[PDB]
């Protein structure tokens, strides 16, 4: 961590050309010029990402070095700062694992019975990048009309085959185009099978040698595993901001209500193996709320929580010291109370960083500028909201379109000369980073209306 | 005349104007007309109408030559058959495409499992006293 004075003084020093280190240090002078937050903050107007800009700074280093590295909770770190809010017209299964292949996590919503979020979990956390998760396996007792409909069902016509469920054969449209049958289709006869579980890449050369669309994976016992087809061999990106725990796979969350009744839904979703909860609630602050964050603690003691939802201080300091492990820092984005979004998420970023119990600043952000600033405010994750409905992973397509948002916030960590989001963070606490506020002439000129 | 031709060849399964690729061609110029006709498993020998197939499963990893099929293809059409017999050996193939070759043991035509699948039965045939399809000039 170097300021833009030493920055400056050290790398001219590196081009090359006395008692001017000597008399003020690698602090060689710049001009004060706009506020420090601690400043911008002080007038009590309740400001929102909207109202002020960030002064640009010194740049040494490209828009591809800014490192994004972010912090979820006390213990899971994450390669993005973003996260998929967990809302029915977000997140998923599908969207949760879009979000951990892109480096950041999402949180599985709770507007179900809660046998259908662990499920939604389980699918969540077997992901495996290459095999197909939760295979269709059919009986050889079947009838193939109940197949070929399948087709009609899922989409999907290359069913493997056996006993009831995870090899005996497979069956395809290839077996079925001309016809109806019980059983005439491909017996145990697979041209190179994976005998064992195998890397992808081992793979990706055993189906360009068989020709096949399909390749199951077995076992020792001469039984099903799990299944590859060439078609999703086909296209299989690389993922190095992989979002996954020590057992090297995928993390994900899960939304929980507050109520008396959710103990139940807080058993099945950790059975499911789920690596962080989040207490929804529109106010964290309350009695049953702090009972059932003292419960989670004292029966699933590695289970990261994260505190339902807050805008003071004050309700910030009765959550952290009921041991929660991150924020929601967010409300009211017509109902009488709330907090000017900006403001908030800098007095309890502010407040939890006296503790080490990162935030997570959602609510009302709908540009790439919103979320660079609130990463500059304190926030070190940043949950999207309805922005990601109507993408093709909403109950356009979030793996191609994420890349965009850590561009943008890449760049804009290079005009403020601030090579990783943790110095973001360390060069707005040190009032190294100067803000500027703008009156409502200086927005209606130059974006926003 | 090319249209009056293309027409009056028809044969209801069989590919009307089959393109041949020649065994001296990397693959990249056979892999894009996929992009230029939309079809892509592609019979192949000296110019015109011997070895295999090339087909995107032979590409779909990949640039080289001629590593793909040699003549080794599965049952085919002898000389020439009924449609209704090519229909079984499809059945029995479970490839893709079928040659049909002459005595002379080169291409002749080619049918597509795809078609296979759609042909229908057509008794109001329209066709001239040689069994093939009638059609005018402006
Ligand atoms: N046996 C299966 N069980 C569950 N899902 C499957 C199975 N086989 C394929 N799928 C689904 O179908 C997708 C595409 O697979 P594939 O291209 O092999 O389909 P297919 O079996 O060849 O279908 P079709 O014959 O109609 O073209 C996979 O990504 C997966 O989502
Ligand atoms: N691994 C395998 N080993 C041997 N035979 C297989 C294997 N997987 C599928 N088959 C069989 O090979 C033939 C073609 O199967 P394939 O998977 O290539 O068809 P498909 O891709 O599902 O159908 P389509 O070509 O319409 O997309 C069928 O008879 C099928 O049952
Ligand atoms: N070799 C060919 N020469 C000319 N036309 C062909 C040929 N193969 C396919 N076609 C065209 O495509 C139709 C049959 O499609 P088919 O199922 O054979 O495509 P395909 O080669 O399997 O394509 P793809 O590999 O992309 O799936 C035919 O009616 C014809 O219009
Ligand atoms: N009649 C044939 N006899 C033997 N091999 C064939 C024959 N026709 C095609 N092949 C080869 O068999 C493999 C599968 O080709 P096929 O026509 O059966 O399906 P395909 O064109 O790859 O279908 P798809 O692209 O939809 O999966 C390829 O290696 C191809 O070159």
């Not at 213990?75 to 996260?83: A, H, Q």
């Not at 899922?154 to 079925?176: A, C, K, M, N, Q």
């Not at 008396?260 to 602050?285: F, H, M, P, W």
């Given at each position: 961590?170097?300021?833009?004075?030493?920055?400056?003084?050290?790398?001219?020093?590196?081009?090359?050309?006395?008692?001017?280190?000597?008399?003020?240090?690698?602090?060689?002078?710049?001009?004060?010029?706009?506020?420090?937050?601690?400043?911008?903050?002080?007038?009590?107007?309740?400001?929102?990402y909207?109202?002020?800009?960030?002064?640009?700074?010194?740049?040494?280093f490209?828009?591809?070095?800014?490192?994004?590295?972010?912090?979820?909770?006390?213990?899971?770190?994450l390669?993005?700062?973003?996260?998929?809010?967990?809302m029915?017209?977000?997140?998923?299964?599908?969207?949760?694992?879009?979000?951990?292949?892109?480096?950041?996590?999402?949180?599985?919503?709770?507007?179900?019975?809660?046998?259908?979020?662990?499920?939604?979990?389980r699918?969540?956390?077997?992901?495996?990048?290459?095999?197909?998760?939760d295979?269709?396996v059919?009986?050889?007792?079947?009838?193939?009309?109940?197949?070929?409909?399948?087709?009609?069902?899922?989409?999907?016509?290359?069913?493997?085959?056996?006993?009831?469920?995870?090899?005996?054969?497979?069956?395809?449209?290839?077996?079925?185009?001309?016809?109806?049958?019980?059983?005439?289709?491909?017996?145990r006869?697979?041209?190179?099978?994976?005998?064992?579980?195998?890397?992808?890449?081992?793979?990706?050369?055993?189906?360009?040698?068989?020709?096949?669309?399909?390749?199951?994976?077995?076992?020792?016992?001469?039984?099903?595993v799990?299944?590859?087809?060439?078609?999703?061999?086909?296209?299989?990106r690389?993922?190095?901001?992989?979002?996954?725990?020590?057992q090297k796979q995928?993390?994900?969350?899960?939304?929980?209500?507050?109520?008396?009744?959710?103990?139940?839904?807080?058993?099945?979703?950790?059975?499911?193996?789920?690596?962080?909860?989040?207490?929804?609630?529109?106010?964290?602050?309350?009695?049953?709320?702090?009972?059932?964050?003292?419960?989670?603690?004292?029966?699933?003691?590695?289970?990261?929580?994260?505190?339902?939802?807050?805008?003071?201080?004050?309700?910030?300091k009765?959550?952290?010291?009921?041991?929660?492990?991150?924020?929601?820092?967010?409300?009211?984005?017509?109902?009488?109370?709330?907090?000017?979004?900006?403001?908030?998420?800098?007095?309890?970023?502010?407040?939890?960083?006296?503790?080490?119990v990162?935030?997570?600043?959602?609510?009302?952000?709908?540009?790439?500028?919103?979320?660079?600033?609130?990463?500059?405010?304190?926030?070190?994750?940043?949950?999207?909201?309805?922005?990601?409905?109507?993408?093709?992973?909403?109950?356009?397509?979030?793996?191609?379109?994420?890349?965009?948002?850590?561009?943008?916030?890449?760049?804009?960590?290079?005009?403020?000369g601030?090579?990783?989001?943790?110095?973001?963070?360390?060069?707005?606490?040190?009032?190294?980073?100067?803000?500027?506020?703008?009156?409502?002439?200086?927005?209606?000129?130059?974006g926003?209306?």
């Amino acid at each position: 961590h170097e300021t833009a004075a030493q920055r400056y003084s050290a790398r001219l020093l590196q081009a090359g050309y006395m008692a001017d280190y000597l008399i003020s240090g690698g602090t060689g002078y710049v001009p004060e010029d706009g506020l420090t937050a601690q400043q911008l903050f002080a007038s009590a107007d309740g400001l929102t990402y909207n109202d002020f800009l960030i002064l640009p700074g010194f740049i040494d280093f490209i828009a591809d070095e800014v490192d994004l590295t972010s912090a979820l909770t006390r213990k899971i770190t994450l390669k993005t700062p973003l996260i998929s809010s967990p809302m029915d017209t977000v997140t998923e299964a599908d969207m949760a694992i879009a979000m951990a292949l892109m480096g950041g996590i999402g949180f599985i919503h709770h507007n179900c019975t809660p046998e259908f979020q662990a499920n939604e979990v389980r699918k969540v956390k077997k992901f495996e990048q290459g095999f197909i998760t939760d295979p269709v396996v059919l009986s050889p007792s079947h009838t193939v009309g109940d197949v070929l409909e399948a087709k009609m069902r899922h989409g999907f016509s290359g069913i493997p085959i056996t006993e009831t469920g995870t090899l005996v054969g497979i069956v395809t449209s290839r077996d079925i185009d001309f016809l109806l049958l019980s059983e005439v289709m491909t017996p145990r006869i697979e041209l190179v099978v994976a005998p064992a579980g195998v890397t992808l890449k081992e793979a990706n050369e055993i189906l360009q040698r068989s020709k096949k669309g399909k390749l199951p994976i077995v076992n020792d016992c001469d039984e099903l595993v799990a299944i590859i087809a060439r078609t999703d061999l086909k296209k299989n990106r690389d993922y190095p901001l992989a979002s996954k725990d020590s057992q090297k796979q995928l993390l994900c969350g899960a939304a929980v209500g507050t109520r008396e009744d959710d103990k139940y839904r807080l058993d099945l979703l950790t059975q499911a193996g789920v690596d962080v909860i989040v207490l929804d609630s529109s106010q964290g602050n309350s009695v049953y709320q702090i009972a059932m964050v003292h419960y989670i603690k004292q029966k699933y003691p590695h289970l990261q929580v994260i505190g339902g939802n807050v805008v003071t201080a004050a309700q910030a300091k009765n959550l952290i010291d009921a041991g929660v492990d991150g924020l929601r820092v967010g409300m009211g984005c017509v109902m009488a109370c709330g907090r000017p979004q900006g403001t908030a998420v800098y007095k309890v970023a502010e407040y939890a960083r006296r503790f080490g119990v990162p935030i997570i600043a959602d609510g009302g952000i709908q540009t790439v500028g919103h979320v660079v600033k609130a990463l500059a405010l304190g926030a070190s994750t940043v949950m999207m909201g309805s922005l990601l409905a109507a993408t093709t992973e909403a109950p356009g397509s979030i793996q191609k379109f994420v890349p965009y948002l850590i561009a943008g916030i890449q760049h804009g960590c290079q005009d403020i000369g601030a090579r990783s989001l943790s110095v973001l963070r360390s060069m707005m606490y040190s009032g190294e980073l100067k803000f500027e506020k703008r009156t409502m002439s200086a927005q209606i000129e130059g974006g926003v209306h």
